[PDB]
Amino acid sequence: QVIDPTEQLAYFPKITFERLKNYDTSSNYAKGKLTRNYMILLPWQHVNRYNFVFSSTGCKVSLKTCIGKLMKDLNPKVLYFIGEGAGNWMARTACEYPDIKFVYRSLKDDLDHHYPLEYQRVIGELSRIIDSGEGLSMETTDATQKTHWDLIHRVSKDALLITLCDAEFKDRDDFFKMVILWRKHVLSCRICTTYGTDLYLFAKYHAKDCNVKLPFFVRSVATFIMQGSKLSGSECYILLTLGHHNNLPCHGEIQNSKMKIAVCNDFYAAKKLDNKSIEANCKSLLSGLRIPINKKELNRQRRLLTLQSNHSSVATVGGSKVIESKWLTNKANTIIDWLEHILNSPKGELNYDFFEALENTYPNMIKLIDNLGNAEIKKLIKVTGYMLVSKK
Ligand SMILES: [Zn+2]
């Protein structure tokens, strides 16, 4: 009925990152490029995320790990989370800082979560979310709109000391709209102006270009490259504050940092296994999948399929075909074939070198990525990651 947040923090994996402090001029080194082309098609950054269901941003980013000193120095009573979705990042934060209250905002588009479903699952009550965006319109929940920032203080009368943004914007102009509006607020708003200029915005950014200037009076303090970000892209987290503007992180600097982590570092597994979560992810991937996943359980799911496939097409009206239902068995077979491959495969360390091995030792790789959808593949990697951790 009542849980302690500190005990839940063992279900969250250790985070590996790289901080790139924004200094004056340059190193004048003309440093070499590090490249490694991993032959991977699957989202392997979900390998250590088996203990989470709706959102798993907390497995990738953490405030204690990245901006711990700033958290101690500023000592915020309230944290503002924008573009939060199911709120797993906010959930990890609630476990690391058990006395902090939250103001949550997420776009009310009804395509993605606009309620903290993961936070509720991890924390239990939602009592610490003093403002959950309830009763707000689609534009007052959209960080690219002035009205969102105008109603941010409707419950909390604490200044925007630290704002966390994990929104995926359409384009960089939409990101700039958010950053400009944040600046406009922290310099207009009575509450925030009273605190001063020591106000921060820690936002997700995709380093596309080079030498792109931040808006006027918006200075980047540091850039964080996370091990948990999709290898393929150029995603990073940038800590911004008020001050003489500088440049956004460049695609080149990000790639080297991103590459070093992939080549050098292993993914840390969670200290404890949340068996209810793993069960939910297993059932979400394949309906009726039980833990532990072994030869017996995989053959039991194959038995359940072989007896299910032999069903005579009898109903009232021909609306849902058995030939159409054979596509659901096709997906199920694809899943079992992969999990069987994982089970038969040797134990290794959680790294992209071993992941490339797992993928290039599997014959129906292209049939897998063609048959399973993006969310299904993410679920498949959560389950795979559990299987690999369970080994030896
Ligand atoms: Zn304000």
Author numbering: 1614 to 2005
Paper text:
The Mononegavirales order groups five families of monopartite, negative-strand RNA viruses many of which are highly pathogenic and/or contagious; the Filoviridae (of which Ebola virus is a representative), the Bornaviridae (Borna disease virus), the Nyamiviridae (midway virus), the Rhabdoviridae (rabies, vesicular stomatitis virus (VSV)) and the Paramyxoviridae (measles virus, human metapneumovirus (hMPV)). These viruses encode a large RNA polymerase (L) (usually >2,000 amino acids) that is crucial to viral replication. As a part of this study, we expressed CR-VI+, a 406-residue fragment comprising CR-VI and the adjoining ‘+ domain’, the variable region carrying the K-K-G-motif, investigated its MTase activity and solved its crystal structure. Both the CR-VI domain, which assumes a fairly standard MTase fold, and the K-K-G motif of the (mainly helical) +domain are required for the MTase reactions.
Most notably, hMPV and flaviviruses share an unusually long (∼10 residues), flexible β2λ (that is, the loop immediately following the β2-strand), which forms the SAM-binding pocket (SAMP) along with loops β1λ and β4λ, shielding it from the solvent. In CR-VI+, β2λ similarly assumes alternate conformations. However, in the absence of SAM, its side chain either moves into the sub-pocket that normally accommodates the NH2 group, or, more markedly, turns towards the solvent in the direction of β2λ, which in this case assumes the ‘open’ position.
